[PDB]
Amino acid sequence: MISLIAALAVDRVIGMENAMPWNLPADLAWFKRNTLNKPVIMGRHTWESIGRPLPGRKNIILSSQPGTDDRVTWVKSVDEAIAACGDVPEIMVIGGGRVYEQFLPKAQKLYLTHIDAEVEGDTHFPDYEPDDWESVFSEFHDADAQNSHSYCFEILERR
Numbered sequence: 001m002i003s004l005i006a007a008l009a010v011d012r013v014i015g016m017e018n019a020m021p022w023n024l025p026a027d028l029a030w031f032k033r034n035t036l037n038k039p040v041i042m043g044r045h046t047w048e049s050i051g052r053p054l055p056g057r058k059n060i061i062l063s064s065q066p067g068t069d070d071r072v073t074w075v076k077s078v079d080e081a082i083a084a085c086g087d088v089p090e091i092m093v094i095g096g097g098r099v100y101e102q103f104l105p106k107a108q109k110l111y112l113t114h115i116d117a118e119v120e121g122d123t124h125f126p127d128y129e130p131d132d133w134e135s136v137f138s139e140f141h142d143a144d145a146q147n148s149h150s151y152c153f154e155i156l157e158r159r
């Protein structure tokens with residue numbers, strides 16, 4: 001099973017200048033909770049944004065070019081990325097925009113954080129078709145001293 005996980009600001013913005021212009025520790029905790037002990041697939045730009053291997057996860061990087069770090073696994077196509085995960089229950093695709101667009105048709109589950117923040121961005125989550133997805137979990141949180149925007153965690157499953 002392939003899942004996508006992402007945090008989206010208003011208008012589906014997911015990044016700006018290879019970074020994310022919000023700091024929401026509760027959402028990072030959610031990301032860790034839902035990805036630990038699973039393989040994670042990311043594009044090369046997201047690998048450079050994260051800046052180091054994510055511990056406790058098999059890190060698979062998509063790039064057309066040879067890899068430059070043997071602490072992670074480098075693959076050259078979508079099919080190779082999936083195969084490199086082996087026979088696990090759930091593969092997590094962690095972006096960025098180009099990678100989400102290629103894996104969305106293959107995904108059964110979306111883990112989305114909707115952040116109530118107006119962010120100029122240069123990268124968006126794919127338009128997906130709402131009729132294709134059932135919301136199975138949602139949990140809203142007001143802003144607090146640690147998280148400066150309200151946010152909603154949602155899980156959707158392909159109908």
Ligand SMILES: NC(=O)c1ccc[n+]([C@@H]2O[C@H](COP(=O)([O-])OP(=O)(O)OC[C@H]3O[C@@H](n4cnc5c(N)ncnc54)[C@H](OP(=O)(O)O)[C@@H]3O)[C@@H](O)[C@H]2O)c1
Nearest residue numbers: 006007015018019043044045046063064095096097098099
């Ligand atoms: N809000 C969130 O949840 C979230 C999550 C992840 C990322 N982001 C943000 O997303 C932005 C980065 O996204 P992006 O769309 O620019 O880049 P991306 O999807 O991270 O990386 C694209 C790169 O991945 C490689 N790639 C993708 N598909 C491939 C394929 N089929 N075969 C081979 N290589 C492939 C290519 O590398 P080569 O050029 O080396 O061939 C391509 O240039 C940043 O702003 C980051 O902060 C946000």
Ligand SMILES: CN(Cc1cnc2nc(N)[nH]c(=O)c2n1)c1ccc(C(=O)N[C@@H](CCC(=O)O)C(=O)O)cc1
Nearest residue numbers: 005006007027028029031032049050054055094095113
């Ligand atoms: C840019 N990026 C890709 C990306 C994909 N999907 C996402 N989905 C959502 N919901 N929120 C995102 O921020 C998000 N980010 C990342 C991803 C992870 C990290 C990072 O440092 N993670 C640590 C933190 C553990 C903690 O603080 O509790 C860890 O996991 O151990 C940094 C940048």
Ligand SMILES: [Mn+2]
Nearest residue numbers: 077078079080
């Ligand atoms: Mn092929």
Ligand SMILES: [Mn+2]
Nearest residue numbers: 083086087088
């Ligand atoms: Mn197999």
Ligand SMILES: [Mn+2]
Nearest residue numbers: 116117149150
């Ligand atoms: Mn806000």
Ligand SMILES: [Mn+2]
Nearest residue numbers: 101126127128
């Ligand atoms: Mn599209």
